[PDB]
Every structure is written in C-alpha cells, then in structure tokens.
Write a protein that holds these residues in place. Structure first.
Motif, mmCIF file in Angstrom:
data_model
loop_
_atom_site.group_PDB
_atom_site.id
_atom_site.type_symbol
_atom_site.label_atom_id
_atom_site.label_comp_id
_atom_site.label_asym_id
_atom_site.label_seq_id
_atom_site.Cartn_x
_atom_site.Cartn_y
_atom_site.Cartn_z
ATOM 1 N N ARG A 1 0.848 -1.174 0.000
ATOM 2 C CA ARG A 1 0.000 0.000 0.000
ATOM 3 C C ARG A 1 0.893 1.237 0.000
ATOM 4 N NH1 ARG A 1 -5.622 0.797 1.581
ATOM 5 N NH2 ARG A 1 -5.768 -1.056 2.884
ATOM 6 N N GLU B 1 1.327 -1.693 7.022
ATOM 7 C CA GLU B 1 -0.115 -1.700 6.908
ATOM 8 C C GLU B 1 -0.852 -1.233 8.176
ATOM 9 O OE1 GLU B 1 -1.737 -2.135 4.245
ATOM 10 O OE2 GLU B 1 -3.726 -1.944 5.147
ATOM 11 N N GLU B 2 -0.412 -1.670 9.348
ATOM 12 C CA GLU B 2 -1.264 -1.583 10.548
ATOM 13 C C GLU B 2 -0.787 -0.640 11.643
ATOM 14 O OE1 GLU B 2 -4.133 -2.547 10.470
ATOM 15 O OE2 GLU B 2 -4.192 -4.145 8.908
ATOM 16 N N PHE C 1 -7.463 3.952 15.691
ATOM 17 C CA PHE C 1 -6.774 2.802 15.095
ATOM 18 C C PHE C 1 -5.455 2.532 15.794
ATOM 19 C CE2 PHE C 1 -9.612 4.504 12.044
ATOM 20 C CZ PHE C 1 -10.208 3.401 11.482
ATOM 21 N N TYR D 1 -19.559 -0.427 4.494
ATOM 22 C CA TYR D 1 -18.194 -0.739 4.947
ATOM 23 C C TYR D 1 -18.267 -1.250 6.369
ATOM 24 C CZ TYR D 1 -13.169 -0.844 5.687
ATOM 25 O OH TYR D 1 -11.882 -1.300 5.922
ATOM 26 N N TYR E 1 -16.289 8.532 15.172
ATOM 27 C CA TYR E 1 -16.428 9.987 15.269
ATOM 28 C C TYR E 1 -17.689 10.447 16.014
ATOM 29 C CZ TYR E 1 -13.000 8.957 11.801
ATOM 30 O OH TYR E 1 -11.885 8.454 11.192
ATOM 31 N N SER F 1 -13.993 -5.357 1.051
ATOM 32 C CA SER F 1 -13.107 -5.556 2.183
ATOM 33 C C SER F 1 -13.930 -5.831 3.446
ATOM 34 C CB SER F 1 -12.203 -4.355 2.349
ATOM 35 O OG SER F 1 -11.061 -4.752 3.053
ATOM 36 N N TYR F 2 -13.839 -4.954 4.447
ATOM 37 C CA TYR F 2 -14.753 -5.058 5.565
ATOM 38 C C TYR F 2 -16.188 -4.983 5.036
ATOM 39 C CZ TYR F 2 -15.773 -5.302 10.554
ATOM 40 O OH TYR F 2 -16.195 -5.738 11.782
ATOM 41 N N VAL G 1 -13.288 -10.503 3.924
ATOM 42 C CA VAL G 1 -12.710 -11.318 4.955
ATOM 43 C C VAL G 1 -13.761 -12.369 5.139
ATOM 44 C CG1 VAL G 1 -12.363 -11.490 7.435
ATOM 45 C CG2 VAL G 1 -11.318 -9.604 6.111
ATOM 46 N N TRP H 1 -11.796 -14.467 10.772
ATOM 47 C CA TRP H 1 -10.904 -13.460 11.324
ATOM 48 C C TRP H 1 -9.491 -14.020 11.565
ATOM 49 C CZ3 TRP H 1 -11.332 -8.800 10.293
ATOM 50 C CH2 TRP H 1 -12.575 -8.156 10.206
ATOM 51 N N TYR I 1 -6.980 -13.052 8.903
ATOM 52 C CA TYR I 1 -6.500 -11.680 8.731
ATOM 53 C C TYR I 1 -5.310 -11.377 9.677
ATOM 54 C CZ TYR I 1 -6.350 -6.959 7.068
ATOM 55 O OH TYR I 1 -5.910 -5.796 6.464
ATOM 56 N N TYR J 1 -4.533 -5.711 13.447
ATOM 57 C CA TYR J 1 -5.877 -5.166 13.222
ATOM 58 C C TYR J 1 -6.955 -5.997 13.919
ATOM 59 C CZ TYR J 1 -10.147 -3.728 10.748
ATOM 60 O OH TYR J 1 -11.429 -3.274 10.437
ATOM 61 N N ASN K 1 -3.029 -8.792 1.195
ATOM 62 C CA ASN K 1 -3.621 -8.201 2.367
ATOM 63 C C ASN K 1 -4.864 -8.956 2.804
ATOM 64 O OD1 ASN K 1 -5.036 -4.856 2.983
ATOM 65 N ND2 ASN K 1 -4.991 -6.714 4.216
ATOM 66 N N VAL K 2 -5.939 -8.950 2.028
ATOM 67 C CA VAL K 2 -7.000 -9.924 2.291
ATOM 68 C C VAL K 2 -6.824 -11.032 1.267
ATOM 69 C CG1 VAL K 2 -9.498 -10.398 2.612
ATOM 70 C CG2 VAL K 2 -8.528 -8.272 3.369
#
Ligand SMILES: *[C@@H]1O[C@H](CO)[C@@H](O[C@@H]2O[C@H](CO)[C@@H](O)[C@H](O)[C@H]2NC(C)=O)[C@H](O)[C@H]1NC(C)=O
Ligand SMILES: *[C@@H]1O[C@H](CO)[C@@H](O[C@@H]2O[C@H](CO)[C@@H](O)[C@H](O)[C@H]2NC(C)=O)[C@H](O)[C@H]1NC(C)=O
Ligand SMILES: O=C([C@@H]1C[C@H](N2CCN(c3ncccn3)CC2)CN1)N1CCC(F)(F)C1
Ligand SMILES: *[C@@H]1O[C@H](CO)[C@@H](O)[C@H](O)[C@H]1NC(C)=O
Length: 728
Positions: A87, A167-168, A319, A509, A547, A592-593, A618, A621, A624, A628, A672-673
């Motif tokens: 990425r 990535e994370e 995150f 998402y 948020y 993705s998600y 995914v 879990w 993955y 994350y 990644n996935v």
C-alpha cells in the motif's frame, strides 16, 4: 434534462476534480507544479516565479515518477524506475541534481533498487535504505556511511517496516526519524525470523512459463509477531573507517513483560524523543520521553515521566494511540484522548506532572490537532451543528479555553461542510480544502487576522460541465435505533419522485470507526447507478462506526460480525418502510470489511435483500492480520476469544445464501486480504448446494486497481445488479 452520468464517465474520468496540491517550503512560501513547471508562491502577496523547468531533464533518459527538493534548496532528488510494492512501500532509482550547478551529481550515487530515501529536516543530509540497511550521506556527492549491518531479506528490517507495521502500525514504509536539527537519526529494526509466511501464486505475463510463488512474512491472528528495537545515531560524529554507533532505547518494563509494538515516534526537541508503545492486548499503552545525556552520550527514559493511556471499554486510540503535539520548548504536549464520557477531545499534559487537562469538551469529537503556536492550538472537529460527518477548522485560545472560534464554518455554509487544512511551518498561513457537499474549494488564509487571502482552485470548469448532466443528489439524515441517533446518506436519482418506488442498493463498509455517511462530494459508481439506472444508493453508519464517541464505537468490541451487521439490516428495514423504496429490489454490496459485512448480511436469513456483491471479503478473522484483528477481537484462544472468532465466520452461514443471489470477487495476488478468504467461502457454499456467481482477477491485489481490471469489475457488477433489479 440532458444526458445522464454514465459508467464510462466514471471508468474513463470524463469529469475531473481539480485539486491544488502545494508543498509548504517555509512559513510564507510553497511549491506548486503549474503545468509540469515548478513554481514557488508567496502566500502573503501571492506573487510567484518558476523554480525549475521540466525541460531541464528532457534528455534524462528515464521518465520521472516524482521529485523531492532539499530543505535548503541546493539539490533536488529525482525518483524513477518506480516499482510498487504494498500500500505504501515501493522501490526506485534515484538521481540527484545540483541546482547551483546545472548538473546531475554522478559519483557516490544512491544505490539502485533503493527501498527508501529521506532528506533531513534542515539542510541536505540524506538517509536511505538499501538491502534492508540504513546508509547516511552528509553530502550528496560524498560516500555514505553504513549505519546498520544486520539487515537480511524478509527477516531483519532496519529503517523500514515489515508487512504488518507498514499496513497496521505506521501506515508507512519508512521507520526513520531525523531530529529537527538533523543531528540524530532515529530508526527502528524489525525481526520477522519466526513470523510465518503467506504464500501465493503470481502468474505474471503470459510469457512466464512457470508461475512464481510470492512469500511474505505475515502474522495472522494469534500467530508469532515481529519484534522491534529502537535506535538513535549521531550523524555529526560519524567516521570513514570506524563503524557508526547506534544507541538503543529500550521499551518500558511494562512492555517487555510480553508481546508489544512501537506505535508512535515523535521528536519533541533537539535532544528529547517521545516514544509510544502498545501491548499485544491493545487496551494499555505507555509513552516515553527520552532526553539525551550530553556527557554519557546516552538516552534516558525516566519512569516518572511515563504517561500511561489505557482503555477500559475497548482498545486505545481510533486505530492506534494518537500522536502527541509538543510545544516548541518540549516540556508539554497536546493529545486527542477519550474523556470520562467516551468522546475524543484535546488534552494538556505537562511533562513532569501527573494527569492532563481537557481543553475541549462536549458531545462531539476532535478529529485532529492541526497546528500549535504560542497563542493558539488548531484542530478539526465535527462539532458544527451536531453533524458527525461534517468537519471544520477551530482555534482554541490557550489563555482562555472558553474562547473557541470557528474559522471555516461560515465561510460558505451551503457549499462547504468538509474541511481539511494545510498550515505553513510556524502556521503563519493555511490552505483550506473543502470536499463538499459542493464542488471542492481551495483557498489560502492568513493566521494573524484570520484573513481570506486568495481562492486557489474553485473547480469552476467542472461546475460548468456538470450543469449539463442529470446529476443525483445526496440526502444526509438520521434514524433511531435503541433510542439513539444513527446517520445515513442516500444518493438520489435525478428528478426524484417521492411518489414512486425506487430500487435500493446498500453501500456498506461498517468496519470499526468507519463512517460512510458524510458531507463529502464524490464522483463514483453510486453516482452512475442513481443518475443513469435510477437506483437509490444508501450508506449507513450504525454501531461500531466512528467519530460519534466510544459508546457507539466500542459497542462492537470483541464482537465483530454482530451489531454492525444487524444494524445494516435494520437500516434496510427502515428504508423499505419509507414509501419510495421497492422492498422487492433491495441489494447490498461492499469491499473488504464491506464485503465481509455484505456476506454476513446475505447469510443472516433476514429475507430483506434480493442479492449482494462482496469484493475481497474477509471470511474468517483468523485469516486476517494480528495487529488489526486482535485490536478488536483479542486472541483466538479458549482462554481469550476463540468462540466468537469461530462464531463470526461467513462459511458457517452458507445455507442461508440458498435464499439470495450472490456475486463473489477477489484478486489472486491480494497480499492483504488473501484469496484464501474467498477460497473458503466458495467451498462452503459448494459443500451445501448453493449456486452463486464468482469472479477472480489474476494478479490483482486488494485494490483491484490496474485500470483494465478496475473497468472490468465495475462493468460486471453493473450487469449483476442491473439484472437482479430487472433493469435494462
Ligand atoms: C515576490 O515579489 C518580490 C518583489 O519582486 C520578490 O522579491 C525579490 O526576490 C528576490 C529574491 O528571491 C530579490 O532578487 C529581490 O531583491 C526581491 N525584492 C524584494 C522587494 O523583496 C520575490 O522574489 C517574489 N516572490 C516570489 C514567490 O517570486
Ligand atoms: C483489556 O482486555 C482484557 C481482556 O478483555 C481485560 O482483562 C479482563 O478483565 C476482566 C476484569 O473485569 C476479566 O473479567 C477478564 O477475565 C479479563 N480477561 C483477561 C484475558 O485478562 C482487561 O480488563 C482489559 N484491560 C484494561 C486495561 O482495561
Ligand atoms: O485492509 C485492511 C486494514 C484496514 C486498516 N485501515 C487503518 C487506517 N484507517 C484509518 N481510517 C481513518 C483514519 C485513520 N486511519 C482505515 C482502516 C488497515 N488495513 N482491512 C482491515 C479491515 C479488513 F476488512 F479486515 C481489511
Ligand atoms: C531475530 O529473532 C530471532 C528469534 O527467533 C533471533 O534468534 C535472532 O537473533 C533475531 N535476529 C536479530 C539479529 O535480532
């Protein structure tokens, strides 16, 4: 009236958002590429010059991917031979040009196949990484000094991250940090010796007889993680024949007790480094302020200065723990922290004193701290009008916290609700960047008497073009679940008719701290479906979303697959009640998600949806990454959280798919996935007699971004959705 927003217009970018991408080079100036040419702009008065003509390099031999000019102006770093990796990472070839002499510097050149290069913050020192080792040039035409000798392929990384840290943890390939002076060079080293490897086929060009096997160290849930060590070097006192001396900073005892990460590295002064560390159980983290010991040439992290940040109802930070913003003198800093009530706000920490002080407070959250001066701290927040998906620049007077002032809220209320900002050094001026709901707007402003200086880009061209097409609109409202407010946006077909019933696609998402409902203006797939195919495209931020405080965000803690799936289904239940939705034609898709969620919703047995698409989903879990997944799920062990790991799989819902039309898409070189994840979905579906549609994409990764494969998937998905809704 007019033609409509078509798929080709999306795929082929028939209508283009202009931006204004500048780069502050001082407190009053900033570079900008005006038609290849590179110009310098004076922010106070607005005049400019050409800094460098591209014609300079017409006979360079290679096309230039990017450029980097040194802080002191003397040199420019040319980048070419860009080979992308993940990425954020890549490799490339670098040349350097002396601006004071019309010539490329041609001796002691940056090695080819270099992994990363940075200037120092001040002057023209270089640090780069080659073969997983750090080198340092005090000058561009001189020999570099080897800093590290440990670096081994796929095993030991100095000055660069391995797969999960990129990535994370850091969101970044680089793991080097110069001091402001540029005197010390901090770096991190990763050890992936016993980190297990993800292996997959890369088929490459037709010309390749035997497919290749790509082998990347990648910790999956519960697996062996990489380790880390932190080092600092004095680049001023280097030598030719004598090896450079890296001084190791060590983690707090409360970290070494088990597996931990290094999450943040912020230099506070010339001789003070802030380090942040995080337990593999990510509810507890420790900051370290480490001052340099003049005489003993070491670095001390007094335990009394350690600032612990800890979460009782979930994980730390959105995150990851937030970055600290230090005052110039470095004896105190500012930070976004969750308060007593669960909302993220700015806190004030003085370095040898115990707790902190919240400057801000209220039923809304600070998104980011943007600038700090003697007089003022600047931040973005979604406070304005209690809209979690709006954004604005505010300033807190540090002499009276009750004196807060919105800088961007009333500028252009109708057109502008989503701001980001870019300040000059020392924050004398800033660039405002509005993303919607209207066409994007780029302005420049002055901090003295918050003066609007100059419009930089107003996208007037685009605006004229788009007056010529049947553009859709966005609704942005909320519904009630659990006596609580949840926000959604619906993109609405042109000439919308409440008195008619439209088909509805749910764009999902829904991963933790996400937000798909917002004031931002986009030209995307959903534009087309609404404009041309007359489909309501809906997005919904339910439980787990971000948020809006921690009551909502952490609801999903140790429980992915639960509420954030259930809340999408409810949102649809509600959208059908509304009398302009044909409840027979309700679809759902996500990437993705989003595609793990889609998939889960399709296998829930609710009967709300006719069909959906999941792209690079995914499916388990444990497949993955460790960083994350464990942040939200914990460990997959009987003593921790094995049962919900195994409960929240897609495979275990196969039977219910027997009720819906499903399209399943993944790329085969997804680092990644992993294609593994979709491989398992399909097999479960097969072992149970469910027909479903599928599409793989050779050699595409998680973004499925090559332009041919971008165009392809969106055509396929368009046919799929179009026919699921009986659209011509
Ligand atoms: C903005 O305009 C001023 C006036 O021309 C420029 O200032 C000159 O800049 C160079 C140094 O780079 C000198 O040779 C002159 O003596 C300067 N004059 C004054 C009055 O300051 C300035 O260069 C311009 N800035 C930009 C962005 O081009
Ligand atoms: C971070 O997560 C772990 C796991 O949820 C928490 O440890 C648990 O604490 C509660 C105490 O009320 C016990 O009921 C659990 O059995 C504990 N389990 C484990 C695995 O230790 C811990 O509370 C969290 N840490 C913080 C700082 O709040
Ligand atoms: O690819 C990823 C993750 C997502 C994750 N990012 C972290 C940074 N993000 C972020 N968002 C807002 C502000 C800052 N960071 C968004 C998610 C990094 N890589 N996946 C995690 C969700 C997945 F579905 F599991 C696939
Ligand atoms: C990497 O970690 C392994 C632990 O399995 C260790 O044996 C090896 O020495 C480490 N490499 C270095 C140079 O730190």
């Amino acid at each position: 009236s007019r033609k409509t927003y078509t798929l080709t217009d999306y795929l082929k970018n028939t209508y283009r958002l202009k931006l204004y991408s500048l780069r502050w080079i001082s407190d009053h100036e900033y570079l900008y590429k005006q038609e290849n040419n590179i110009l310098v702009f004076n922010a106070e008065y607005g005049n400019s010059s050409v800094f460098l003509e591209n014609s300079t390099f017409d006979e360079f031999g290679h096309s230039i991917n990017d450029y980097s000019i040194s802080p002191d102006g003397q040199f420019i770093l040319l980048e070419y031979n860009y080979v992308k990796q993940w990425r954020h990472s890549y490799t490339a070839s670098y040349d350097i040009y002396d601006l004071n002499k019309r010539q490329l510097i041609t001796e002691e050149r940056i090695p080819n196949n270099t992994q990363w290069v940075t200037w120092s913050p001040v002057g023209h020192k270089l640090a780069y990484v080659w073969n997983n080792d750090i080198y340092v040039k005090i000058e561009p035409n001189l020999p570099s000094y080897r800093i590290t000798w440990t670096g081994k392929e796929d095993i030991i990384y100095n000055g660069i991250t391995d797969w999960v840290y990129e990535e994370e943890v850091f969101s970044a390939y680089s793991a080097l940090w110069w001091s402001p002076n540029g005197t010390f060079l901090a770096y991190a080293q990763f050890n992936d010796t016993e980190v297990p490897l993800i292996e997959y086929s890369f088929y490459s060009d037709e010309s390749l007889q035997y497919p290749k096997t790509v082998r990347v160290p990648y910790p999956k849930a519960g697996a062996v993680n990489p380790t880390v060590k932190f080092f600092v070097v004095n680049t001023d006192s280097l030598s030719s024949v004598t090896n450079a001396t890296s001084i190791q900073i060590t983690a707090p005892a409360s970290m070494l007790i088990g597996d931990h990460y290094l999450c943040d590295v912020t230099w506070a002064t010339q001789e003070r480094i802030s380090l942040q560390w995080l337990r593999r159980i990510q509810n507890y983290s420790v900051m370290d302020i480490c001052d340099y010991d003049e005489s003993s040439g070491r670095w001390n992290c007094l335990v009394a200065r350690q600032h612990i940040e800890m979460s009782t109802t979930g994980w730390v930070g959105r995150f990851r723990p937030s970055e600290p913003h230090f005052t110039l003198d470095g004896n105190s800093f500012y930070k976004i922290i969750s308060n007593e009530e669960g909302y993220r706000h700015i806190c004030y920490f003085q370095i040898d004193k115990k707790d902190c002080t919240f400057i801000t407070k209220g039923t809304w959250e600070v998104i980011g701290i943007e600038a700090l001066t003697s007089d003022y701290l600047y931040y973005i927040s979604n406070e304005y009008k209690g809209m979690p998906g709006g954004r604005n620049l505010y300033k807190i007077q540090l002499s009276d916290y009750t004196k807060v002032t919105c800088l961007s809220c009333e500028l252009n209320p109708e057109r502008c609700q989503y701001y980001s900002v870019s300040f000059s050094k020392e924050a004398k001026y800033y660039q405002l960047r509005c993303s919607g709901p209207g066409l994007p707007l780029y302005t420049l402003h002055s901090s003295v008497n918050d003066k609007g200086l100059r419009v930089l880009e107003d996208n007037s061209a685009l605006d004229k073009m788009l007056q010529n097409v049947q553009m859709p609109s966005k609704k942005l409202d909320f519904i009630i679940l659990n006596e609580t407010k949840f926000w959604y946006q619906m993109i609405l077909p042109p000439h919308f008719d409440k008195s008619k019933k439209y088909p509805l696609l749910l764009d999902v998402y829904a991963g933790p701290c996400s937000q798909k409902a917002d004031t931002v203006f986009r030209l995307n797939w959903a534009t087309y479906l609404a404009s041309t195919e007359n489909i309501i495209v809906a997005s919904f931020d339910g439980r787990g979303s971000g948020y809006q405080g921690d009551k909502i965000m952490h609801a999903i803690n140790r429980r992915l697959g639960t509420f954030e799936v259930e809340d999408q289904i409810e949102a649809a239940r509600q959208f059908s009640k509304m009398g302009f939705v044909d409840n027979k034609r309700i679809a759902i898709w996500g990437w993705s998600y989003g595609g793990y969620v889609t998939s889960m919703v399709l296998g829930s047995g609710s009967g709300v949806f006719k069909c959906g698409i999941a792209v690079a989903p995914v499916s388990r879990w444990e497949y993955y990454d460790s960083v994350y997944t464990e942040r939200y799920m914990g460990l997959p062990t009987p003593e921790d959280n094995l049962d919900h790991y195994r409960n929240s799989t897609v495979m275990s819902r196969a039977e219910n798919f027997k009720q819906v039309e499903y399209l399943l898409i993944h790329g085969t070189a997804d680092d990644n996935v992993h294609f593994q994840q979709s491989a398992q979905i399909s097999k479960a579906l097969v072992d149970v007699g469910v027909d479903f549609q599928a599409m793989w994409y050779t050699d595409e990764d998680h973004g499925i971004a090559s332009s041919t494969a971008h165009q392809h998937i969106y055509t396929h998905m368009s046919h799929f959705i179009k026919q699921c809704f009986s659209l011509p």
